[PDB]
Design a protein around this ligand. Structure first.
Ligand code: CLA
Ligand code: CLA
Ligand code: CLA
Ligand code: CLA
Ligand code: CLA
Ligand code: CLA
Ligand code: CLA
Ligand SMILES: CC1=C(/C=C/C(C)=C/C=C/C(C)=C/C=C/C=C(C)/C=C/C=C(C)/C=C/C2=C(C)CCCC2(C)C)C(C)(C)CCC1
Ligand SMILES: CC1=C(/C=C/C(C)=C/C=C/C(C)=C/C=C/C=C(C)/C=C/C=C(C)/C=C/C2=C(C)CCCC2(C)C)C(C)(C)CCC1
Ligand SMILES: CC1=C(/C=C/C(C)=C/C=C/C(C)=C\C=C\C=C(C)\C=C\C=C(C)\C=C\C2=C(C)CCCC2(C)C)C(C)(C)CCC1
Ligand SMILES: CC1=C(C/C=C(\C)CCC[C@H](C)CCC[C@H](C)CCCC(C)C)C(=O)c2ccccc2C1=O
Ligand code: SF4
Ligand code: SF4
Ligand code: SF4
Lengths: 140, 161, 741, 80, 73, 74, 74, 63
């Protein structure tokens, strides 16, 4: 999708945990994940505890991308939900779309992606670190 | 003699150690009634101590100022009862063990399940190699001359350097 | 009839076929070894039945049969003590004089000069001195003859064979179903009544009919060979009435509720027997009767086939409050569907019980002439401390295993487990603050005392001649216990134990038990104990609570219970698993138990154990130096370790030389542990590659490729070596010290 | 931020992308193997460096390589 | 300490302490500039090794000086 | 006793030389990590993959040989 | 007399470890394989496995034998 | 080289450098490493085969 997030999506019913985001989420960086459910059931939170996911649409704020992707892995390998979307909320109310970027999962091939970081030789043909001395660059 | 050492048969401190060793067990002996197996065990200990000291005196060992035997690992012929003859004995036995292990390794490599032949030993074949490793200095020399003992060197894996 | 026996017939065929197929229990290891890691994985996964089968019924059957095999091993271990007492001991000569003959039931073979270990233990016998206390245990049962020990050993062998047969039978012939094991109410009733209460009742019967008359005759001065045999005492009301003049009335006062007529052999006199320095055996028999009645009464609580009784599901679900949400709901299913939770509870209870046994058997010597046998007391205390510490670490280990594997969020929503997991940072933070506060205070008082004594300022110390820290609460509790007989124990003749104050008890010069005075050093070392226990609790509780997830790693439960790390990422995720938390907490358990047993040894050698002469002149072993030397770390180092290692370092050439050998070897093993504990796998793998090059050059490459030990295995090997070396050094030091003084 | 590189010994078996917990890797089309795809690292600023991709590579001496470098609040995995 | 215990245990402990400082009154007004993290792996090995060496030297020097001084021979 | 302790000293020298020479010669790479020169002289590890790579750099070889130097000097 | 000897021996151990550490650093980021083609320095890396294995043999032999003699005397 | 040949690996960063393996399949296409070689010794991850180029194999025995 695009960089838009519905702030009024209902949240899973949770009793409050001591694992939530700290002061540096309203200051630096915050993440949210939204998914669609078919029934009311109980899932384990990545910040400990258990929460009931609402039937319909859900929204949940986390502190790092690892927590959102671990929750997405739980929503995949368990009871099948595969339309989750992970965002990144800045303190100036600016949202950025991260997971399912091109609309499809990264493991499936998608025409229109550009290879980044690809190297045109085997790993044993990197230059020696003597040849990059006093240059600032590296042999990667 | 060598290094200022005296023979243990001609050393007074060795005899003093003999007397102290037998006197400690004799003092331990005085609280037991005769004929009891404790008394027999203690007098057997006394006899064993006397026999050990007499053997150390008779074998030609050299004792120092502390009255203890000192081994000369020099290689002199008169001290070949020290290091050199046990050296030859251990070298023969260790080569026996190594050649038996190597022969069974070759056999287990040449089979269909090399892994299962090493956790579960083929006992008849293992006993065969184990007993046939008695002529290891000749078989190893024959394999060295035939070029089967050593890999050329371009066929063993090596780190990139 | 809901509670019933349902049993499968011939589930598993008895065959020597999977014996020749190692690693058959798991899917991965059954395909054969490729490297030398399949061996260690085979050894590590042998008893992990939860990873071998997904069926709880087969897991329970394996557990039951393994319990039978363990009980067979324990029966063989009882039989060894009885047989060595029968055939290889000086138990008769010890019975004729249990104050100058040293117990010994272990003789060595003379082959290599090791016959010097057969020391002069007295009674015309040569052997290794025994600190197990089995001799006093047999004397407390009336086993004055050496035939009864032999037949007890034979019966133990028969029972071990019975347990082996039962273990084969219940896994290969008649394996119970899952519904049999889940009858926890029936199991609880049957254990509480038939095991505990009937064992207490039968042991009280044996005590009353055998050990009371035999020990009374022994304390009267009758030699053991002129004492009536126990079968001659069992059916002789005339002889028992001669000894205890209440058997004339027979069993009639028992049924008429005139139990006061049985006060000749069922007493509550308390204190210690002056002849033996132990508890009165009439008190012991009365104690076992009270326990038997209490346990049989308690075994009638839970519901079975008949309508009376409790359901444990209804008791738990009724206990809930405002601050805890749903309360104990869902714990019944947790404890009836998981074995790891039951381990996590039972191991904690058994470790705490062993520690309680250690604290109770020194101040209340229960066996005759065991108080004046100082090596026995020291060995039993230190033994039960180490067993308790190991079990209390294992409880946290299995709690972590349950949390990783058997936890379910749908089952345990908003109950006590969920609420604990939802605020674990607060728990760990506050316990961290308590650990820091206790450590700074308890250890910095020692360091401050070191600095003041080194600076020549003894008036600024924390001592009794200086700024005082008197344990006023412990002294008040001691004064309350000393005034208990008559006031708050009105039908009591003496105090519960003389450690709370009272009279010195002496048996043939040696001190059995005397009052233990508490000063500022005792306050300091008790705070040290509290701090060490708190840090061990912090490590283990943090491992249990953060076993599933944390802020660092959100998906720690998907990695397993034990795993080395999650890479060098996030700055480094080394030792994040709950297994590594148990590995770290075992060291702190070792530290805590070592300090506890050091405190016990020094305080008992300094203020309790010793000799008495004319006009009550008390001379202790070390001279009462604990009050002024246990205030500094230098005082500990100089006056405990350096001063009491003289016995273990000068034991060469005597009967205690094995203790010096084990001292040196345990130092070697403890130092050998740091090789695994400090280093890492990759260096050893590269060194193994360099060795494999030479092997490949000489056509000596094994098909099972040699690999370095894994990271978890390297940590486990280092920890096991560390614990073995430490416990061996302390074992040899204690035994060589206390045998020789 | 760490730097992730994928070399041409890739076989396109996708295990590195599945093993990634931070959505760093993705599959782009390619013609150098039978699967017709090569791994790519377009979001290396979200790399934490846990090297789960390098554990999942089946090729002899892994094609996807993570070099630990500068540390930020994302590569350190800090929630505070 | 640093030679046997490794980063993960200490990083989780630091995170709990960070929550403790951020969520207590009065003291949460005092705010750090650098986010507290556990020592890195190589840094931990260096610190433990430096501790090992300094303790080694400072426990052998007093012995080799005082034992010779305490005997004069 | 001089004979035995001289043999102990030779043991210490040879083992410290073993650790240091192995680190120096495997600093550029080994079978477990053929591209060790790309990661520098000092780095934590290469992850838990392919068995585990604790203490794999040459700096870790220095760190291991420091203990052996202290032992033999003692 | 005691302090000066222990002083200089510990400093000798430190300098000895540092020399090998800097040789490892030189191998990591200063050694040019094309400049040292078939050199006396590259041949050291050519047969490094033999060197490490023989240091392993000497260290294991010395440790086995001197510890066995010491434990025998004990 | 052909399918079933015995080859020696010349790739220096490979686990089986200067080691003998068996060719399993030679792909005919645009693959940069078409030859599949299977080995009797697993590496540190435990993987037996690997894809190799035609210039990285020295050949030992014909099918
Ligand atoms: C019979 C098998 C065998 C043989 C011939 C060798 C031969 C050799 N090993 Mg060796 N080794 C073996 C087994 C064997 N090893 C095993 C099982 C281990 C693991 C514990 C090692 C660990 C090892 C190391 C760590 C080192 C050597 C080294 C060496 C070389 C120098 C000699 C030495 O140090 O011996 C010392 C040998 C040992 C300490 C291990 C002995 C273990 C037992 C006693 C031998 C195995 C016998 C086997 C079970 C017999 C079963 C066969 C039967 C069914 C017929 C030499 C090429 C050194 C080297 O590279 O020098 C160039 C070196 O540093 N080895
Ligand atoms: C009154 C009946 C009774 C008794 C005495 C026991 C006793 C025992 N059960 Mg048990 N159990 C019972 C009923 C009973 N159970 C019922 C009804 C169930 C089903 C709900 C179970 C289910 C159960 C399980 C699942 C397990 C046990 C286990 C155990 C043992 C615990 C280990 C221990 O304390 O060692 C104490 C050791 C002894 C006391 C030694 C004596 C051993 C014998 C077998 C005890 C009985 C002897 C006999 C009846 C008395 C004869 C008296 C005669 C001399 C006059 C112990 C032997 C555990 C075990 O170890 O398995 C083997 C275990 O895993 N039980
Ligand atoms: C399991 C434990 C146990 C066992 C096997 C026995 C067994 C026995 N007791 Mg006994 N007893 C016990 C516990 C036990 N007691 C306890 C706990 C007490 C304390 C209250 C007593 C107090 C007691 C007295 C005071 C007497 C016995 C007597 C007897 C014997 C005859 C009783 C009989 O069978 O009458 C038939 C059974 C019934 C009528 C029921 C018999 C050997 C008598 C005796 O000495 O016999 C020689 C006797 O006078 N008992
Ligand atoms: C009631 C006791 C009890 C029981 C039934 C279990 C049962 C279990 N534990 Mg456990 N544990 C216990 C007590 C117990 N533990 C205690 C007290 C501790 C604290 C130390 C632990 C710590 C612990 C850990 C940390 C782990 C387990 C694991 C396991 C499981 C697999 C064990 C296995 O396969 O090992 C097979 C058995 C062996 C490999 C034998 C071990 C031999 C020891 C290390 C050496 C003993 C030396 C000896 C005493 C003296 C030698 C002297 C020398 C001179 C020769 C299994 C369910 C593991 C698991 O994955 O659980 C799911 C696991 O990771 N446990
Ligand atoms: C003698 C060695 C030693 C010492 C001093 C410590 C000290 C500590 N360890 Mg520990 N540890 C050690 C060995 C040691 N460990 C080993 C070998 C291991 C490996 C198994 C571990 C594993 C380990 C774990 C796993 C944990 C600890 C924890 C702790 C801390 C407990 C909290 C506390 O009371 O701190 C207070 C400080 C002290 C007790 C020591 C100093 C006391 C001084 C004398 C008084 C105060 C001085 C003051 C602060 C500074 C003034 C002087 C200055 C101005 C110059 C503390 C820092 C725990 C922790 O940090 O959680 C709270 C924890 O979880 N350690
Ligand atoms: C003439 C001698 C000499 C010189 C010029 C250098 C120079 C250098 N070394 Mg070096 N080194 C030396 C001797 C020397 N070393 C010796 C003898 C050893 C063996 C112990 C080492 C081991 C060594 C290693 C392992 C490494 C270096 C590195 C370096 C380079 C960077 C230095 C750096 O970052 O440190 C900056 C300064 C510090 C880190 C200060 C740390 C303070 C130390 C730990 C002592 C602190 C303990 C303190 C005294 C305790 C007080 C006790 C009190 C409380 C009682 C630099 C080129 C590093 C490098 O860049 O290589 C690629 C590197 O990795 N060296
Ligand atoms: C007292 C503690 C201790 C001991 C004994 C050792 C022992 C050893 N370390 Mg070591 N190490 C330690 C602490 C210790 N380390 C610490 C704290 C560190 C810091 C992390 C290291 C770091 C370290 C490194 C980095 C290296 C070693 C190496 C070695 C080996 C040197 C070769 C040797 O002496 O073989 C002798 C073997 C022994 C002393 C082990 C005991 C074997 C048995 C029990 C001896 C019994 C005597 C007699 C033969 C019995 C007959 C056997 C019978 C079956 C017939 C050896 C296994 C080096 C190595 O592996 O090279 C080969 C190596 O590279 N260690
Ligand atoms: C040492 C040992 C041993 C032995 C043991 C024994 C010897 C045991 C015994 C046991 C016994 C010998 C037991 C018994 C028991 C009994 C009982 C337990 C009884 C009960 C009774 C009752 C309970 C009663 C009731 C009643 C009443 C009161 C009323 C009503 C009626 C009637 C009568 C019913 C062995 C060898 C094994 C091994 C080793 C160790
Ligand atoms: C006259 C005399 C004599 C002789 C003497 C001599 C001849 C001696 C020598 C000695 C020697 C001869 C010594 C040596 C030593 C050596 C060493 C000690 C070495 C070391 C090395 C190192 C440390 C290395 C380093 C490095 C690296 C690692 C890498 C590369 C670079 C470098 C080089 C930096 C006699 C005895 C007859 C007697 C009389 C007198
Ligand atoms: C005269 C003498 C002496 C000296 C000695 C010496 C100096 C020696 C040297 C020696 C040497 C300088 C040696 C070298 C060597 C080299 C080599 C190179 C070797 C090799 C070997 C091998 C190769 C083996 C193999 C095998 C076999 C054949 C058997 C077993 C198995 C195996 C495969 C392992 C002394 C004074 C002590 C004493 C007196 C006498
Ligand atoms: C030495 C060491 C190794 C190498 C250790 C290995 C390969 C263990 C070898 C096991 C042997 C083969 C078992 C038998 C030992 C001897 C053959 C028998 C000795 C018997 C004595 C009682 C005399 C690691 O793999 C390792 C991994 C992680 C952290 C630290 C370390 C570590 O310190
Ligand atoms: S796991 Fe490795 S080989 Fe497979 S697609 Fe990813 S980078 Fe390529
Ligand atoms: S290091 Fe971790 S986050 Fe980065 S690409 Fe590899 S698996 Fe993904
Ligand atoms: S155990 Fe080794 S590989 Fe794992 S994080 Fe620690 S240093 Fe890295």
């Amino acid at each position: 999708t695009s960089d838009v997030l519905n702030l009024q999506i209902p949240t899973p019913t949770f009793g409050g945990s001591t694992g939530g985001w700290l002061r540096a989420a309203e200051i630096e960086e915050k993440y949210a994940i939204t998914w669609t459910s078919k029934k009311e059931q109980i899932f384990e939170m990545p910040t400990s505890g258990a929460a009931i996911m609402q039937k319909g649409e859900n929204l949940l704020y986390l502190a790092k991308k690892e927590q959102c992707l671990a929750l997405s892995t739980q929503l995949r390998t368990l009871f099948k939900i595969s339309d989750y979307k992970i965002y990144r909320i800045f303190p100036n109310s600016e949202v950025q779309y991260l997971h399912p970027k091109d609309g499809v999962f990264p493991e499936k091939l998608n025409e229109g992606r550009i290879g980044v970081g690809n190297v045109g030789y085997s790993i044993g043909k990197n230059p020696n670190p003597v040849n990059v001395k006093f240059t600032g660059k590296n042999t990667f | 003699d060598v290094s200022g050492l005296t023979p243990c048969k001609d050393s007074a401190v060795f005899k003093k150690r003999l007397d102290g060793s037998v006197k400690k067990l004799q003092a331990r002996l005085a609280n037991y009634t005769e004929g009891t197996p404790a008394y027999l065990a203690l007098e057997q200990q006394i006899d064993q101590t006397k026999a050990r000291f007499a053997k150390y005196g008779d074998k030609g060992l050299l004792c120092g100022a502390d009255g203890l035997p000192h081994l000369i690992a020099d290689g002199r012929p008169d001290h070949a009862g020290e290091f050199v003859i046990p050296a030859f004995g251990f070298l023969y036995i260790a080569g026996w063990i190594g050649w038996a292990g190597r022969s069974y390794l070759q056999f287990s490599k040449k089979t269909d399940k090399p892994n299962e032949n090493e956790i579960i030993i083929n006992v008849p074949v293992a006993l065969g190699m184990m007993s046939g490793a008695f002529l290891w200095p000749l078989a190893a020399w024959k394999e060295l001359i035939n070029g089967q003992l050593l890999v050329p060197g371009d066929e063993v894996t090596v780190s990139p350097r | 009839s809901k509670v019933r026996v349902i049993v499968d017939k011939d589930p598993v065929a008895t065959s020597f076929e999977k014996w020749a197929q190692p690693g058959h229990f798991s899917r991965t290891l059954a395909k054969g070894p490729k490297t030398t890691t399949w061996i260690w994985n085979l050894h590590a996964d042998a008893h992990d039945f939860d990873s071998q089968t997904s069926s709880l019924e087969d897991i329970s059957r394996k557990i039951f049969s393994a319990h039978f095999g363990q009980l067979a091993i324990i029966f063989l271990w009882v039989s060894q003590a009885y047989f060595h007492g029968a055939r290889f001991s000086n138990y008769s000569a010890w019975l004729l004089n249990p104050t100058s003959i040293k117990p010994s039931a272990q003789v060595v073979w003379p082959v290599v000069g090791q016959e010097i270990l057969n020391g002069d233990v007295g009674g015309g016998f040569s052997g290794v001195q025994i600190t197990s206390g089995v001799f006093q245990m047999w004397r407390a049962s009336g086993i004055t003859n050496e035939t009864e020990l032999y037949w007890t050993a034979m019966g133990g062998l028969m029972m071990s064979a019975l347990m082996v047969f039962a273990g084969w039978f219940h896994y290969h012939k008649a394996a119970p179903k899952l519904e049999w094991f889940q009858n926890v109410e029936s199991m609880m009733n049957h254990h509480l009544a038939g095991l505990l209460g009937l064992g207490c009742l039968s042991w009280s019967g044996h005590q009353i009919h055998i050990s009371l008359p035999i020990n009374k005759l022994l304390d009267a001065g009758v030699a053991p060979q002129e004492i009536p045999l126990p079968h001659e005492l069992l059916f002789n009301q005339d002889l028992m009435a001669q000894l205890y003049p209440s058997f004339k009335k027979g069993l009639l006062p028992f049924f008429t509720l005139n139990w006061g007529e049985y006060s000749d052999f069922l007493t509550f006199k308390g204190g210690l027997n002056p002849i033996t320095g132990s508890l009165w055996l009439s008190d012991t028999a009365h104690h076992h009767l009270a326990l038997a009645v209490l346990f049989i009464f308690a075994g009638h609580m839970y519901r079975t086939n008949w309508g009376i009784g409790h359901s444990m599901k209804e008791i738990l679900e009724a206990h809930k409050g405002p601050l805890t949400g749903e309360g104990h709901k869902g714990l019944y299913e947790i404890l009836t569907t998981s074995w790891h939770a039951q381990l996590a509870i039972n191991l904690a209870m058994m470790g705490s019980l062993s520690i309680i046994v250690a604290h109770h058997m020194y101040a209340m010597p229960p066996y005759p002439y065991i108080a004046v046998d100082y090596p026995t007391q020291l060995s039993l205390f230190t033994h039960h401390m180490w067993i308790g510490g190991f079990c209390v670490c294992g409880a946290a280990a299995h709690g972590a295993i349950f949390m990783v594997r058997d936890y379910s969020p749908v089952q345990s929503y908003n109950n006590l487990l969920d609420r604990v997991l939802r605020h674990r940072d607060a728990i760990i933070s506050h316990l961290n603050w308590v650990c820091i506060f206790l450590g700074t205070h308890s250890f910095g008082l020692y360091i401050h005392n070191d600095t003041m004594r080194a600076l020549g300022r003894p008036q600024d110390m924390f001592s009794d001649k200086a700024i005082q820290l008197q344990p006023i609460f412990a002294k008040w509790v001691q004064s309350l216990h000393t005034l208990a007989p008559g006031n708050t124990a009105p039908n009591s003749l003496a105090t519960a134990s003389y450690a709370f104050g009272g009279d010195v008890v002496a048996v043939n010069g040696k001190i059995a038990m005397m009052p233990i005075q508490l000063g500022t050093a005792d306050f300091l070392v008790h705070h040290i104990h509290a701090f060490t226990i708190h840090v061990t609790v912090l490590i283990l509780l943090k491992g249990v609570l953060f076993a599933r997830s944390s802020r660092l790693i959100p998906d720690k439960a998907n990695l397993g219970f034990r795993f080395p790390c999650d890479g060098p990422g996030r700055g480094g995720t080394c030792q994040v698993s709950a297994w590594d938390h148990i590995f770290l907490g075992l060291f702190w358990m070792y530290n805590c138990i070592s300090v506890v047993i050091f405190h016990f040894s020094w305080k008992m050698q300094s203020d309790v154990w010793g000799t008495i002469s004319e006009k009550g002149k008390i001379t202790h072993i070390t001279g009462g130096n604990f009050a002024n030397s246990a205030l500094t770390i230098n005082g500990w180092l100089r006056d405990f370790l350096w001063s009491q290692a003289s016995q273990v370092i000068q034991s060469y050439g005597s009967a205690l030389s094995a203790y010096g050998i084990i001292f040196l070897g345990a130092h070697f093993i403890w130092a050998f542990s740091l090789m695994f504990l400090f280093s890492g796998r990759g260096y050893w793998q590269e060194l193994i590659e360099s060795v494999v090059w030479a092997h490949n050059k000489l056509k000596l490459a094994p098909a099972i490729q040699p690999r370095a030990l894994s990271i978890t295995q390297g940590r486990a090997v280092g920890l096991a070596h560390y614990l073995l070396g430490g416990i061996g050094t302390t074992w040899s030091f204690f035994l060589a010290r206390i045998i020789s003084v | 931020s760490h730097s992730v590189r994928v070399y041409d010994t890739c076989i396109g078996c996708t295990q590195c992308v599945r093993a990634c917990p931070c959505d760093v890797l993705e599959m782009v089309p390619w013609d150098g193997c039978k699967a017709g795809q090569i791994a790519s690292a377009p979001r290396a600023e979200d790399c934490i460096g846990c090297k789960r991709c390098e554990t999942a590579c089946p090729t002899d001496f892994l094609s996807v390589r993570v070099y630990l470098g500068s540390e930020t609040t994302r590569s350190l995995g800090l929630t505070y | 300490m640093f030679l046997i215990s490794w980063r993960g245990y200490w990083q989780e402990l630091i995170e709990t302490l960070v929550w403790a400082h951020e969520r207590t009154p009065i003291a949460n007004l005092v705010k750090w500039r650098d986010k507290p993290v556990a020592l890195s792996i190589v840094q931990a090995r260096l610190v433990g090794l430096a501790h090992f060496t300094v303790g080694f030297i400072f426990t052998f020097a007093p012995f080799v000086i005082a034992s010779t001084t305490g005997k004069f021979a | 006793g001089d004979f035995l302790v001289h043999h102990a000293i030779a043991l210490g020298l040879h083992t410290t030389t073993l650790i240091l020479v192995k680190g120096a010669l495997d600093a550029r790479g080994s079978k477990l990590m053929p591209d060790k020169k790309d990661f520098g002289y000092s780095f934590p590890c290469d992850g838990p993959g392919r068995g585990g790579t604790c203490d794999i750099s040459a700096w870790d070889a220095f760190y291991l040989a420091m203990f052996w130097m202290l032992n033999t000097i003692s | 007399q005691a302090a000066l000897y222990t002083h200089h021996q510990y400093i000798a151990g430190f300098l000895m470890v540092g020399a090998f550490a800097h040789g490892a650093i030189f191998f990591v980021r200063d050694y040019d394989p094309e400049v040292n083609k078939d050199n006396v320095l590259a041949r050291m890396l050519q047969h490094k496995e033999a060197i490490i294995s023989h240091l392993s043999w000497v260290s294991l032999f010395l440790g086995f034998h001197t510890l066995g003699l010491y434990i025998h005397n004990d | 080289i052909e399918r079933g040949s015995k080859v020696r690996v010349l790739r220096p960063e490979s686990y089986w450098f200067q080691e003998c393996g068996s060719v399993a399949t030679i792909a005919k296409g645009g693959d940069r490493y078409p030859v599949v070689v299977r080995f009797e010794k697993v590496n540190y991850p435990g993987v037996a085969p690997n894809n190799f180029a035609l210039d990285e194999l020295g050949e030992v025995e014909a099918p």
